[PDB]
């Protein structure tokens, strides 16, 4: 709390609208709203000055200014639980290295073995109890047994509301390590209901927040079940397209990072899941899939996800544009008349690509086939895409085994890894056997010793010296 309040404002900075454009459009009995949309007669609430040369109109570049952030601390959501949750306020141009350093060192989070991403539509939706319990149990189990980050949105409506709901469901029992399902949230600062009770310079420590639904306009309220929030600035009042670019950049930079524990190094795997999105999910799914993320679309209660599920295993290019139009004309009653003849083309092309690559794309099949606890389905799709990656020198085998040992699920190791891909001379399992012994994993050492590694070998002078160096650093 002493070295944290220092490492925030003089490196992280916030955007503001210096220039004083008047109101071209006045909306909802307000004249203070001027283009960007903050208060005061000018565009923003800053000093009413000519602001250098009085060039007509403003440019999101010429007239957006970056100054040090003044809002940060530990948000407490009134009487709705006493947990104290961190929050910071950032802008467009902050390199992902700064946020990663803050989140790993200053905030106290640990580097995850998996980055599960939750992106979905924001129109409120209601779904059947069976699929509801399946999703909750699967998400909580896969995100608790691997110590993964659950980065998602910070709103209180939609899929992110569902994941807040699932985190609450976990905290209901909380058999051990209740505060371990850390869920960083990403949302726009410019659209928050009670955000004026958070602007306090040089430390807004326990700044109480009040949430009130059906008291806003189009703006959004914060959630109460998440663990961390990162809010982005643009010096704008009612836009929703600023969190997605930064979130994609940060999520890409996270997977670049490598975790090295026990002597085996892996780059953090990165998975995506979607639930009934809208127009922007066909951004996020494409943007994720082109990179190589195992996007996992779920069949059931879907405006967009159900479309991929329906057109999923039907082979590529066997679908016509008119066929896609008639597919879309049976699911979108509210706006079935406001769909332009060009809106079909974008969706046709993107569905074409996504469904064309079925190695990366994976359909859940809620209850038909593969209807497990979702955790193993996500892990199975992730290892499918990892198997689909490039490998020249028998590297897929070792990488998949290293990743399985990095997690703590032996069922995956025996039912996907150790059953298939041939070869695996017993000397090959030695490097990961060391990590299994070091991290105290008895199930994996039993399995490896079953496959053929002999305790008569593998205990070398060098190996013993290595093991004694990495002895448990809490021992007499």
């Amino acid at each position: 709390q002493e070295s944290l309040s220092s490492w925030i404002p003089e490196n992280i900075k916030k955007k503001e609208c210096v220039y004083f454009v008047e109101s071209s459009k006045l909306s909802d009995a307000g004249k203070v709203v001027c283009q960007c949309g903050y208060t005061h007669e000018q565009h923003l609430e800053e000093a009413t000055k000519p602001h250098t040369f009085q060039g007509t109109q403003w440019d999101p570049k010429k007239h957006v200014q970056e100054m040090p952030t003044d809002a940060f601390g530990d948000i407490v959501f009134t009487g709705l639980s006493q947990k104290v949750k961190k929050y910071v306020r950032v802008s467009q141009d902050t390199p992902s290295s700064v946020i990663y350093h803050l989140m790993t060192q200053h905030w106290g989070l640990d580097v995850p073995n998996l980055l599960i991403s939750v992106t979905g539509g924001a129109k409120n939706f209601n779904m059947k109890p069976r699929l509801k319990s399946i999703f909750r149990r699967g998400l909580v189990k896969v995100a608790q047994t691997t110590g993964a980050w659950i980065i998602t949105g910070g709103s209180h409506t939609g899929v992110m509301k569902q994941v807040g709901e699932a985190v609450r469901d976990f905290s209901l029992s909380s058999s051990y390590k209740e505060g371990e399902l850390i869920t960083i949230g990403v949302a726009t600062w410019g659209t928050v209901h009670r955000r004026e009770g958070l602007i306090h310079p040089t430390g807004s420590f326990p700044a109480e927040y009040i949430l009130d639904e059906d008291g806003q306009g189009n703006l959004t309220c914060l959630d109460s079940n998440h663990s961390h929030f990162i809010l982005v600035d643009d010096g704008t009042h009612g836009q929703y397209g600023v969190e997605i670019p930064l979130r994609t950049r940060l999520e890409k930079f996270i997977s670049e990072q490598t975790k090295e524990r026990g002597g085996v190094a892996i780059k953090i795997p990165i998975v995506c899941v979607v639930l009934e999105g809208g127009p922007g999910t066909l951004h996020t799914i494409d943007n994720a899939t082109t990179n190589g993320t195992p996007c996992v679309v779920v069949e059931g209660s879907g405006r967009v996800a159900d479309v991929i599920a329906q057109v999923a295993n039907i082979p590529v290019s066997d679908i016509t544009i008119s066929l896609i139009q008639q597919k879309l004309s049976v699911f979108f009653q509210e706006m079935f008349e406001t769909f332009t003849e060009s809106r079909i083309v974008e969706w046709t092309k993107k569905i074409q690509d996504i469904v064309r690559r079925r190695q990366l794309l994976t359909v859940f099949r809620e209850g038909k086939d593969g209807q497990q606890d979702v955790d193993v389905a996500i892990l199975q799709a992730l290892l499918k895409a990892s198997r689909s990656q490039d490998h020249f020198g028998h590297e897929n085998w070792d990488h998949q085994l290293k990743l399985a040992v990095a997690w703590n699920r032996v069922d995956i190791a025996r039912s996907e890894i150790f059953m298939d891909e041939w070869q695996w001379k017993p000397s090959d399992l030695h490097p990961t056997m060391t990590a299994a012994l070091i991290s105290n994993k008895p199930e994996f050492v039993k399995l490896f010793l079953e496959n053929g590694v002999q305790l008569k070998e593998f205990v070398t002078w060098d190996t013993l010296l290595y093991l004694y160096e990495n002895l448990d650093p809490s021992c007499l």
């Binding site: 082979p315 590529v316 290019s317 066997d318 209807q371």
Partner: peptide, 19 residues
């Protein structure tokens, strides 16, 4: 016996163009 009955409860509950 308790472990054997659980999986059984689970079982009863579950049941190209070239351009």
């Amino acid at each position: 016996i308790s472990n054997k009955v659980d999986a059984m409860v689970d079982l009863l509950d579950l049941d190209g163009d070239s351009y």
